[PDB]
């Protein structure tokens, strides 16, 4: 399996939006959850993006697609963005399963100004 992440690079002006599209390709396991991460300009630390506000995610599990649209961009939003698939393994208990990290997109290098 692999995550097909587009676009690879983007340049936007402040105030514009970016849509990043991810598609889980040649899947073995069923897509359960998704995550979005960024290393912002000036920083070496990759951090999680909380979905909400300027950050709007749309997930279509049937087409194995998940997208992030970031509105009202500012120059500090510039950086590398990566999406990630998550899967689960069953357990012998509940209603309680085992979530685990899946494949990551290759990234989108965004430049804002």
Automatic annotation (TrEMBL):
Domain Ig-like: from-to ranges: 1-85
Keyword annotations from UniProtKB, A to Z: Receptor
UniProt key word DNA-binding: no
SUPFAM superfamilies, per the entry: Immunoglobulin
InterPro entries reported for this sequence: Ig-like_dom, Ig-like_dom_sf, Ig-like_fold, Ig_sub, Ig_V-set
Pfam families assigned: V-set
Regions that span the bilayer: none
PROSITE patterns: IG_LIKE
CDD domains: IgV (cd00099)
Cystine pairings recorded for this chain: 22-83
Domain of life: Eukaryota
Protein name: New antigen receptor variable domain
Organism from which the protein derives: Orectolobus maculatus
